[PDB]
Design a protein around this ligand. Structure first.
Ligand code: HEM
Ligand code: HEM
Ligand SMILES: Cc1cc(N)nc2cc(-c3ccc(OCc4cncs4)c(CN)c3)ccc12
Ligand SMILES: Cc1cc(N)nc2cc(-c3ccc(OCc4cncs4)c(CN)c3)ccc12
Ligand SMILES: C[C@H](O)[C@H](O)[C@H]1CNc2nc(N)[nH]c(=O)c2N1
Ligand SMILES: C[C@H](O)[C@H](O)[C@H]1CNc2nc(N)[nH]c(=O)c2N1
Ligand SMILES: [Zn+2]
Lengths: 411, 411
């Protein structure tokens, strides 16, 4: 039960003991593996909350080499008293930063976690309003963008109290392109965002009705009705997409935004629930070129590219889709690199992640990792993670999925 | 208790009740997923319940559950077990068991074909020479001058584990690999260890880059014996590219018939340790894995060089670009020679149709996403966005340790 993981390309074998510190459940059993289910899974009672806090504080004071010390047992008793009275408690700034960095470190589906300890944590727990939320988010966007030299950052709004005062960012990402249904049949813009683009218009947004319309922010503070805000265009760094060999690639009129900033997950630390916590890093190239541009329920521009390449699109066996997919992804990296916007290719990121796995097994005894999500969506087996056995388990602090607010909001 | 899976590209949801018929374990727990782990002497005590389960299944399939033919067969198997400690399958039961072992193979993307399996009963076989003759006939039937036909040949079952029939080759047809004194490898690096055993057993190695290996066959627990498959039975395909004239000059070829021979077939508690089976190749098995894996023929560089790509930075996606061309050449070569092959697009589309049909008429289809998704262009195939449930049903094909590690040598 001190488990082992083998890399079948290198025979490197790592021994995993970290998983024995795992708390939450995977969704699997001994009779069924749910490893490819997208999503398994109204406040903590006074009783379940203190053990959660103790476990978090225990692991915090160990990290700073002060387990079982004056400061440890004092803080333990101090939190204990606050929970007894207030029915909740507040994290010290130090615990907030540690909690956030480790929620990313424990994100078993994230290939970028080698960077986990270089996270810029913005404490927005003093925020009271959507305008205030919008301010914190503009500052996040500007700081993270850094004129193309991207920097990882998270902004943490007040924690849930009773589920009635929730702070929520209704957008799935801070920056996403609009999607409009067409009267004839097709979809203009980004099909992934069609329902949200409706809720925005259905809330008062005047849509330019283009391909690359940056969506407004829909910010919900303290549980009130959300409010629309327009991100200043000068804060939205965008890369025009061209190909280093094909001049007709420009004519496609494609661009993408430089900042991936996910805004709909929930950050859990020591039992406390931060329902608004947008976090951002930088893109792996395939996240745009493979998924955003070539998924059938997305931009789906594969056919148009292969046509312009004069490829034989009559039989799948010509691999014209694969040929185009590569060129599209070559262009994305060329364009970002040309404009000095941070981006990483799938070979670099997976090689980094194997090294990160090395470190985590060495200095921590393991690293939870979700093979189904770590392997890039193209050229899987020529990347090092394909031949790496991985163990998946849920550690805390964590980022968790949460319902879309409009399905829940008492409007 | 029912279970749902969702295709996130089509929003089709399916309901799995078949997982309730699951017996064996997956390796997962409530707290760990072993979904990416490559691989996570039987007495009368536990044999009749396994037989009864199989026979209940079998007679259900022929709509004779509870018939006198069913009850008589149960009794007949019982008496044979308490008397002889094992039992013999009827031909009908053997054919059913073999077809369902394939139908239950959760890592096999080709299972749309599972019911068109040609089953060769080799249970009267007694010697390695007889094994050679049975395998020769399998190869000729299966190859069918390029119009490939799925087939399996079933040798006598295990008795006391000291008289096993084994095929020591991992596939019936595979190329030798030779480690040179300078550290390089001539031939297929995947086969260096088996090649060395063969040479040690008396095989005269041509020491070429595509030498078909000899058959190493073990009957009734005796030491294995060497045989050369007649060269006219081994259909091979020279690999050329439809646009790149220089591609032929790499001197590449591959064999046409994939025939896996180191697995164990389990049916009603009986263990068939030698049971080679064969179908036809999906293109990526050769062009992605066999040619481009770093630990295989690893022709990526040579192809990239001859294409004159930017091999300096990996972000030029030269590896991705050469991988597509190589897989184009493999498909073009097989199709031009009218040797059955399927591309990864056609095969994954079929599997989705197969899987939906299985959910309808069977209540489920065990599926291993980690293995079903092709090793290139994953997200542009439809299985990528398909949730799958993985569980173990019997009859089944299982892994078994290589015989040279367990075999007791006669001398
Ligand atoms: C710095 C560069 C980063 C890269 C290249 C990166 C890469 C990725 C990729 C490719 C995925 C798969 C998602 C998909 O395929 O759509 C992912 C998932 C994820 N990333 Fe990272 N990431 C980065 C930074 C971060 C940061 C700063 C955080 C939080 C502080 C984070 C948290 C997550 C989470 C929570 C998931 C999904 C986990 C789940 O759904 O359970 N990432 N990442
Ligand atoms: C007819 C055409 C077939 C195709 C195109 C096909 C395709 C595949 C592929 C691509 C894999 C993954 C192996 C890898 O990529 O390394 C696989 C696995 C497998 N195939 Fe099929 N297959 C076919 C026929 C058959 C037949 C006839 C049998 C047995 C009677 C079979 C049994 C299996 C098994 C048992 C596995 C997985 C072994 C494991 O659990 O590790 N296949 N198949
Ligand atoms: C910081 C950062 C940088 C980056 N470069 N990439 C990221 C991708 C993610 C992520 C997490 C879950 C997803 O899951 C999709 C679902 C929608 N509904 C149920 S699951 C997706 C898909 N974009 C992305 C999160 C953060 C990222
Ligand atoms: C009949 C048929 C047709 C085909 N077209 N393809 C096949 C691939 C397979 C298979 C199953 C597991 C494998 O891998 C197991 C392991 C490797 N290392 C540790 S377990 C491999 C690798 N050759 C192949 C088996 C049968 C196939
Ligand atoms: C560690 C990992 O499970 C291993 O490399 C698997 C992944 N998926 C695979 N999928 C297929 N089709 N074939 C393989 O050999 C593998 N190898
Ligand atoms: C059905 C399947 O689980 C789903 O498509 C998952 C698979 N793997 C993924 N992997 C990544 N990195 N991102 C994704 O969105 C998905 N989608
Ligand atoms: Zn699992």
């Amino acid at each position: 039960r001190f488990l082992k993981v083998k890399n079948w390309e290198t025979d490197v074998v790592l021994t995993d003991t970290l998983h024995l510190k795992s708390t939450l459940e995977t969704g699997c059993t001994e009779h069924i593996c749910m490893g490819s289910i997208m999503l398994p899974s109204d406040v903590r009672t006074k009783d379940q909350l203190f053990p959660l806090a103790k476990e978090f504080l225990d692991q915090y004071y160990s990290s700073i080499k002060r387990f079982g010390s004056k400061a440890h047992m004092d803080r333990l008793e101090e939190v204990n008293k606050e929970i007894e009275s207030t029915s909740t408690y507040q994290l010290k700034d130090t615990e907030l930063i540690y909690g956030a960095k480790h929620a990313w470190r424990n994100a078993s589906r994230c290939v970028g976690r080698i960077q986990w300890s270089k996270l810029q944590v913005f404490d927005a727990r003093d925020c009271t309003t959507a305008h205030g939320m919008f301010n914190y988010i503009c500052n996040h966007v500007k700081y993270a963008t850094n004129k193309g030299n991207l920097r990882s950052a998270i902004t943490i709004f007040p924690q849930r109290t009773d589920g009635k005062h929730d702070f929520r960012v209704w957008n799935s990402q801070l920056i996403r392109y609009a999607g409009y249904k067409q009267p004839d049949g097709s979809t203009l813009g980004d099909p992934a965002n069609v329902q949200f683009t409706e809720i925005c218009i259905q809330q008062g947004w005047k849509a330019p009705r283009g391909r690359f319309d940056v969506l407004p922010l829909l910010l919900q503070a303290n549980g009130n009705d959300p409010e629309l805000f327009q991100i200043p265009p000068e804060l939205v760094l965008e890369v025009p997409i061209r190909h280093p060999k094909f001049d007709w690639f420009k004519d496609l009129g494609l661009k993408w935004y430089g900042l991936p900033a996910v805004s709909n997950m929930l950050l859990e630390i020591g039992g406390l629930e931060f329902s608004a916590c947008p976090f951002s890093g930088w893109y792996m190239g395939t996240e745009i070129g493979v998924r955003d541009y070539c998924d059938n329920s997305r931009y789906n521009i594969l056919e148009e590219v292969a046509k312009k390449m004069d490829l034989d699109m009559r039989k799948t066996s010509s691999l014209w889709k694969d040929q185009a997919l590569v060129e599209i992804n070559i262009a994305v990296l060329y364009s970002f690199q040309s404009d000095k916007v941070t981006i990483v290719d799938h070979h670099s990121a997976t090689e980094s992640f194997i090294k990160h796995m090395e470190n985590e097994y060495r200095c921590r005894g393991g690293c939870p990792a979700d093979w189904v999500w770590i392997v890039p969506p193209m050229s899987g087996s020529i990347t090092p993670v394909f031949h790496q056995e991985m163990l998946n388990y849920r550690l805390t602090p964590s980022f968790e999925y949460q319902p879309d607010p409009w399905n829940t909001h008492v409007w």
